Structure formats: structure tokens, C-alpha cells
């Protein structure tokens, strides 16, 4: 079963919001050092984007980031509601089904 | 139509960036491994599609939006997210 996808539910320890963070190739660094905080809640995707599962309001997210990395930073921040994916390895698919119920 | 947002790993950037072409003026790139696309496709559809050209064993996600907030200097990727999103 390498295929796999989730509602996203918000029930037990799945927080309701559920938030896709994107960012620019230059700035991959500084946006993970800034995403760790944010504990087990979130996984890195790729160098440029991030799932975050935490009640914030986007625009919120959004305020926040650009006081850290500063105003004119280039990000986008989608609220998601499913998510389809596919992996290969064992260690990624087991965190990942946890960190999407 | 539908919003979604395809990520893929690192590795696959210019295979995943030369399939999203197919979808034109709907789709926007983000970054070297993040798009947007606007388009009435179901996701388990759109991820067999990717992974019969891609491979089999390729890394993807695609999630379905329901809002978007960005600041941007990609003046293609402000233009179809104000446009096409909603
Ligand atoms: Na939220
Ligand atoms: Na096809």
C-alpha cells in the first residue's frame, strides 16, 4: 500500500486547522528553522513547503512570519481539507498517518 | 472548479514542473517543488495520472484548499491565485 489519503478530521488529537506553508527557494533555510518551533505538529514536505496542523488563522500565520523573516518575504498560506499521497518509505508513511489521522 | 496544491520532493522538480504544463493558465508555480492548480479533477485521479508518467515510486501530495492568504513577488502566481481561487 504505498497510496494513502485523509480527511484531515478534526477529532482527538487532529487539531482543526490544517495548513499547507509555502515558501521561495532562496528562502528554504530560514523558513525550516522557523517551522521547528512548531514541534511534531508539523513535517516538512519538500525544501519549500510544510504541513502544519494547529488552530491558527492563516492571515494570523501569515502576520507572524513576516515579523520573523521580514515584510517582504514571498509566502503562501492554503488552509487544506484532504490531502492524497504517496511514499515509498515505511518511516515517512507511519509518521505521516499519525500527523494527518 | 476544484483548488489543490501538488507537492513533490527535490529530486523530481523538473519532471513534475514539465507534466503541470498540460494544465496551462490554471496552474501556477510556487516553487522549484510546489503548484497550484485550478481544476475539476478528482485527487486520486490526479495522483494515479502523476505516478503512470512520473513513476511509480514518487513522492506526492496533493491537497485540496479551501482558502489561500500570500504575499507574493511572482506576479503569475498573484494573478491566477486573485483570479481562479475564489
Ligand atoms: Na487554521
Ligand atoms: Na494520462
Same mark, same amino acid.
Given at each position: #500500500? #504505498?497510496? #494513502?489519503?485523509?480527511?484531515? $478530521?478534526?477529532?482527538?488529537? #487532529?487539531?482543526?486547522?490544517? *495548513? $499547507?506553508? =509555502?515558501?521561495?527557494?532562496?528562502?528554504?533555510? !530560514?523558513?525550516?528553522?522557523?517551522? &521547528?518551533?512548531?514541534?511534531?505538529? &508539523? @513535517?516538512?514536505?519538500?525544501?519549500?513547503?510544510?504541513? *502544519? %496542523?494547529? %488552530?491558527? $488563522?492563516?492571515? @494570523?500565520? &501569515?502576520?507572524?512570519? *513576516?515579523?520573523? =523573516?521580514?515584510? /517582504?518575504? +514571498?509566502?503562501?498560506?492554503?488552509? !487544506? +481539507?484532504? $490531502? @492524497? /499521497?504517496? @511514499?515509498?518509505?515505511? %518511516?515517512?508513511?507511519?509518521?505521516?498517518? +499519525? *500527523?494527518?489521522?
Amino acid at each position: #500500500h #504505498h497510496h #494513502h489519503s485523509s480527511g484531515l $478530521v478534526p477529532r482527538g488529537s #487532529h487539531m482543526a486547522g490544517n *495548513l $499547507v506553508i =509555502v515558501c521561495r527557494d532562496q528562502d528554504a533555510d !530560514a523558513f525550516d528553522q522557523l517551522m &521547528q518551533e512548531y514541534g511534531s505538529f &508539523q @513535517t516538512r514536505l519538500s525544501s519549500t513547503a510544510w504541513y *502544519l %496542523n494547529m %488552530n491558527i $488563522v492563516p492571515e @494570523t500565520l &501569515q502576520e507572524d512570519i *513576516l515579523e520573523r =523573516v521580514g515584510k /517582504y518575504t +514571498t509566502l503562501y498560506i492554503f488552509e !487544506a +481539507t484532504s $490531502v @492524497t /499521497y504517496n @511514499t515509498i518509505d515505511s %518511516n515517512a508513511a507511519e509518521t505521516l498517518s +499519525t *500527523l494527518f489521522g
